[model samples]
Target chain A: GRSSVRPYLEECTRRFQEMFDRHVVTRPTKVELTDAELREVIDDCNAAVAPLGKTVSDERWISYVGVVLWSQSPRHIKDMEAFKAVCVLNCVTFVWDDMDPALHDFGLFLPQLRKICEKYYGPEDAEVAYEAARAFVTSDHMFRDSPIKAALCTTSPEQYFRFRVTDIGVDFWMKMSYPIYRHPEFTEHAKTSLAARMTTRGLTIVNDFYSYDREVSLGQITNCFRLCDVSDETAFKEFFQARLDDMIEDIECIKAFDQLTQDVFLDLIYGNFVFTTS
Target chain B: GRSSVRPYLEECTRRFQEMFDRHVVTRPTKVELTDAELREVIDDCNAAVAPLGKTVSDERWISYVGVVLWSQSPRHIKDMEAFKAVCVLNCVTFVWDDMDPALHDFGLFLPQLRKICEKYYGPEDAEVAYEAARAFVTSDHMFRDSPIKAALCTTSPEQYFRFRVTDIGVDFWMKMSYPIYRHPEFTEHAKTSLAARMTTRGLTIVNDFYSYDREVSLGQITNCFRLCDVSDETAFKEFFQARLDDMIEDIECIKAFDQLTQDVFLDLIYGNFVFTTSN
Candidate 1:
């Protein structure tokens, strides 16, 4: 069943890439961190988690922390301390994925991350990071639980979509960015906006598509293509169309904001595409 | 069109009342503040807002602060300070509704509320209170705006329900209770629970039905009954059934929690029904 869906997935991915190339704007200049600064961030992150006996390999750090996050941080973050904090936090996210869920305790990881945030930002940002971490851990556990993991196979599209939206923890990630953006109006609007929700859906679908083979190899049943009730080809077409439409609608909704806010969202939407494709 | 729906509304109300009587448990021994303490709390609340040149009349305070909030606080809140803070916060919610939206600025009210919360709870709880107030103010403004308000009339049932869930600000109100309950597990589960979402929908429907006449008189189009696309009779029946089913489903979901958490939600669901139906 999974093997049969590969052709449909490739076709959808190609079409999505075409849409992205045409509609989504990319940054003209990429930000770069000096070798010394990037290495310091990596060392700082590893030392922060050294108590837990966890480390981020140089390859993973260079690819995700150095390439993906470092490229974007200097553009939005002006303060040097805030810039370093974002890099360390992004490194923590990657390191978290590397750890075994059963072996590693969030109880230990959370406070270490919290202390780093408080050091860089303050108690307020630390608190925000704590809550987002809780949301991410809780939602991840819920998604992995047997009944919920099995739910997608039999659930209505609405129920499945709702579960997946929160399961992806995109909202929590966007919220963690608020301490950086510091845009009150944009933050409030983004929380309840339909466009934001659609963006989350689109991002989650793209990830599920890209990760299907890896997840399948690991015997994961959570991918949309595997669990969807429709035929493989039908599911692929419907999801592709939904993602395409969501991007267009999201662009329309972004127009309602001022230029600065619009730029923030455009960068976010475009950045996610660039990172995922790369 | 509205007049025709009254019977259906009445029927739904009766059915809901019966369900409340049967399935929902209520606290037997009521908690009370001494008359002197109650008076002091009310005076404190009034004084807290007096700087803003606002007052909570004795009548409104007696009914809401004295009766509704005062009755519940002592049961859940053991500390006198926490109890007083809850009363003042609830009092502030009522006073906010009394003020004209254009005349009063949230800019002023928010800091005032923040100061009061900080005095009672501290900066952490103050921040929670601040965020909840923002959520309430933002959702209230969004619902009142013409384009979004009008969208309800044409939106699909799902879209309309989603808007109302946030617009009603039930989640915000529930979150504000966390500082008092101090239960982290319950707080987290409540945020993502389907049962909690359904409870919000059920509560919103009940409010819309009861306030339909008052809102209509005020020329408001935000009520579900007013904005729904269905005939008045059909709309009432469908909504009534939904509320009924939601209450039943919500009860089932509550069973999954431990006894303490279950007791907390039972008090909340039952308390809201009692407060709304009172006078």
Candidate 2:
């Protein structure tokens, strides 16, 4: 996957990270998780999903108590952001608020995300999850509420972060739980403790666990995803960053806490990693 | 609901039956089936599923197997011999026999259909099921196959049915599985018996039971549906008469059956049923 290599393999070592940097959607005014709130939310998640690892014998209603938290977003200033935000809006509508009742047919384990209208910058009705994802990738974190964008190389130059702090979207932010529970370095009991919060009562925390769980170097691959499918990298990385921050704050690490958080989806869907995040 | 004053209530009533009479599709080329062969097919479906059920301690898979048998519709040429002949070409495509698995998601209980398709269809070939569904509805079952009208609807009216016979454009057809299953009478264990058979697997055998179980009277609803729709009852009767007969055999009674079958679908998909076969 290199542009060109002449006689020797060494010639190709100078691969362009700039190419990725060029296309990678960079956003301004992204949501910044406060050290304290980030820790609390992440910890809450870790403690929630604690019981799942043991056995199906102890099936909890994590899937039922849908913890849809919204991240506050600012007005979108980028074109890619706008396009992706709209696309995300359309996609989220498929499983809109009306869909919660429909979840009954899926299985009892399905998480029930009750619509909660939390005030972000200003109070408004809860938008659909997909819309939240859309607004998220496209706008400022502190202003408009969004989850992720759905557009490619679109109108944005930057697309790094993905989070929202609002009552307008989810019962909880779109991050994940269980990473702290399964952190190898942590004790099994600690893992259990974290899991309790991650999945306690009956809630499935939506987060980056599904998207950017990649140990794969996120260079051009991340950017290529923007061109090929803009939604891929933009959606996934934000999901990952969101989750990583979630895990770090939950476990409470001093320096490089968020560093170990993974893109859980890679493991969940593809089973790519050696260890699972709980 | 009436016998004397309401004998017309019977879908099998003379005037009602006329609506469906020769519209029933059938074929003279006659795909023959020995009673023993039919029984054996049923037995195989039961056998495959029985063991699987024992292994999983659940009978859902067997029912799915039975669904294969249940959906295994034969080339019904009830009375409309010409339409029957045409129906064969339209409905015949390789979904069950493609070697790859069907939408069998249900995890331990059985992967959901979505997961099952993902496991089996692979991302690339995923469109096949969708396309197949489209093919059967739009092009699969039509009389336009007659060389008389190659593009009958689009080009030549005569060939229109032929062109539609093989196309899987029938979106509602794809969605009907759930309603049929939830018909209350159509249980999973019953379905597994049919799933074992290759040819007769997809037929909806217990439909008779479902017909009896539905609570609402269908005849009353027909006029209700026909109100804003077809004006002339004679033509409407003819259209349905010609159609329903195409599905099953030995439909001796008409008005009763019409109430039982035709009028019941009045509320589906925002009333798309009335217009489905008309054009």
Candidate 3:
């Protein structure tokens, strides 16, 4: 089932990133967004998913409609690329937290990332990221595990990250990521000694799996409406460009560390996969 | 509400008259429609009712979709003119049965109508319609009292027609219709008279009454998607022409009679409504 979830997971991340870029959360991460600005953003998000107006045969608000619709939306369902268009926002948000160490203008936001982690993915993750970040900044300890590294607590980071190309589900994969406290936030930077990191490989592993029966039934709404089905190259590119950008903006604007914790939690939890671009 | 409903009620009848003139259901009633034809007709009907689709967005459907929508669609919610439309079909069927003295065509349909009435409204209304029809023809009495002209099974033929009219909820100032057992089948003839009957009062009712609150609510879909905001005569008229046309076709389909009974029971049921263009 974990393998089956790979494609959707990837795509959701990609779209989030793209949207992150466009919205560009330029407000100081330390200050709260005005309620009016927040509502405007909410409306913008609503419009972002409004493309579903044709497919979601209901009278409900557009966001929920997207929750039931984006999968079939040409922007999200085609391949990794389409998914990336929608998921880039989510992925960028996760990556933003991952990158916060060098960019933490203040220790203010480290808590925000922890908040995103706690609310959606579980407080265990928030604690893990919090502890790891604290070790890096305060203690001279060269801690490796960061929130975005996706590691499990049970294993040492050294052996697992070496060749962890398999879709070992969350337990094992998170363990592999535990030691990588700092990853190349920029795509090209990830190609290096970061070679051992299985981010893209994990994506491929996800892309390789499929569940036909589920696709026939729940697939439409779960993956299809959510824009979680796209698994191709162009879509992945679009996803990175479109949604990932939005996620960055969201993270950059996040005022409280608690909020950041929830954003991460949501990224890992509600986010689905697609390996391609928009 | 009742006052506003009067005009739509008339509109429903008039539109049916128009469509009744257009698509002629010449075939004898049976489980007799091609798959493609049925699907096509259904598609057409769904399209026709597109404007009025919002009207059924009441609490009933909204709450149900909120609960079980991940699985199935909720059944139709009754509101506004949907009932007036249904009643016209029922009334016409009743008059058709009373058309013949032999009541042969009506007899042909007895088993089917009874079963449908049992399922849709209740066993009582079906039984009452049956017993009333049986007595009006076979017995020496009328089954129910007229809502309009107060009369009984007097020997006078005019009183007999008057008795039937009121009994069937077709209280169009005419007490009842005369049970004229004549010619090429009273079913067709009764179709005409029923339209004429409803129109006689329907025509006058619209001119005299003005709208109230309840009517506005019913005129629109219940909340979430209310037609509540219509302001002018022009919008109302346009909506009336478009919406009533669809409702009339829906009313003419007589699909409910077919839907209400169980399969084996349907096989046993006798006949159905004689859909006519007033032809």
Candidate 4:
């Protein structure tokens, strides 16, 4: 049910998005795939997942992967297949997590990813790459059926949010920046930092605010709001504003990691808002 | 690989067990399995997991399920078949978590359990039982290749330990207390409470203390001891006393539950020490 205060919550989210844009530093990135190329990636993604016992609609898959994700991303990959690789990561993670929370365990994806990484990263160092990729994705993907939920969130926010960043594949997306931005060291360094962890809070908070209505309808709990004892709007205002404040402070700490690295998280904070709202 | 401090740890653990015994209110219970029946259950467990591309040594399989699990269990389930059901849970969860930390996903075991619960719990209620059971196991099993581990335990002690209790299937074991103690209402009520959550901590801490040296040798991080930036003895004393204190406090809270319920977790705290030391 859409609560009576729905419009006010929507307005609050819009205001938060505006607050995000104000704080995030800008960076230029240009990469485009034409409509034909976008269609190809969508079908390719859908077809690839068909064997996994799932499928996604072209209308649903296309814009998010090829347009919205690519358009808003600060990482620019001129080559289309590598860009498609990034898109596929987005598609598979988002869809699998959506279709089956109960059945979805994060480890299910590792075997196939190991094989794919072996193909792409090559044999000699492929196992190493697979482990690294596994580590990143493991940190990135939060299986909805986690123990913390079973405990009714008796698990604290510090422990809980450590895994929450991966809820949106922020690490994996940032790793894709190696291909997208042609900057390998950037991802290598970012993955090991306090700021990368902080960036995830900003990213998930924005998406949570946007998707709160749909999540409530689906009987899915997506944010701190659901777990808290406070009323919905009160929790929203507190968590939403608090996360924004933390992210701004995080940005101040992360600005030393070269401007591009700073922009990467800033892009996430800002882009998470822009595309989440869009 | 035994450290100089090992004897003291052994003595310290013995004291903690004594600490655990003082707090736990006992209720009488018993269960028995014949040698032939336990062998049959082991064979059945082996045959079942074989389909899942997993194998466990008969020696390894027998104790956790049949002997130690049965002997130390506080619940007295008289029916052998019900006891067999409990053993099957231990075999699947323990062996799968052992085989490949990397490939250990909870869904892999669901199909077989679904069939078993359907046969036992039946079609109408089987699906519901399976979901509840799955929720229990998902909360219980800790796949070693967890994201938190890959992040090198960047998670805090409070955060890490929250899930750590279920690392060894404490919840599933408690559910088995239904058949073991022949107290269905005990487990039925336990699943929906704060004590059930607290019970896991006490259970896991006992196992962690017993298995600490072996875990260190295997390069496995199982306890809160590994995380703290303190002297081994200092951390051991602090965490050991701290967890025992917490478990005793937890027992004080849970003593309000029926006496049989209090015995169930006491069995865990005591049994975990026995079984881990056995292994």
Q: Model 3 over residues B174-223: C-alpha lDDT tens digits?
A: 11111111112222212222222222222212211222335344442111
Worst 10 residues of 3 chain A by lDDT: A187-196
Candidate 2: Cα lDDT at A169: 29
Worst 10 residues of 2 chain B by lDDT: B193-202
Per-residue lDDT over A119-173 for candidate 2, one digit per residue giving the tens place of the 0 to 100 score: 1111211232222333322222222221122221122221111111211222122
Off by over 4 Å in 3: A1-278, B1-5, B24-231, B244-279
Tell me how each candidate scores on DockQ against the true complex: 0.23, 0.01, 0.00, 0.03
Candidate 1 residue-wise lDDT, B171-239, digit = tens: 555555556666665556545433244355556666777777777778776566665433466665676
Residue A209, candidate 1: alpha-carbon lDDT = 71
Query: First chain TM-score in every candidate?
Result: 0.81, 0.23, 0.23, 0.76
* Residue A156's lDDT in candidate 2: 27
How many backbone clashes are present in model 4?
7
Better of 1 and 2 by lDDT: 1
Write model 4 residue lDDT over A1-278, tens digit each, in one string.
Answer: 33333645667676775665566546334456677867666665665456566557877785556423533454443334445656665666566656644554555565655544443443433443344455444432323454433333234444334445444556455544344454543544332223345466667666666666677677665454454543466765676566666556555544544555556656656665655555
Question: What range of 10 consecutive residues in model 3 chain B has the weakest lDDT sum?
Answer: B262-271
Best by TM-score: 1
Docking class of 1: incorrect
Alpha-carbon deviation at A80 in model 2, angstroms: 11
Instruction: Report the CA-based lDDT of candidate 1 relative to the real structure.
Output: 0.60
> DockQ score of candidate 2?
0.01
Full-model lDDT, candidate 3: 0.28
Give the candidates in order of TM-score, highest first: 1, 4, 2, 3
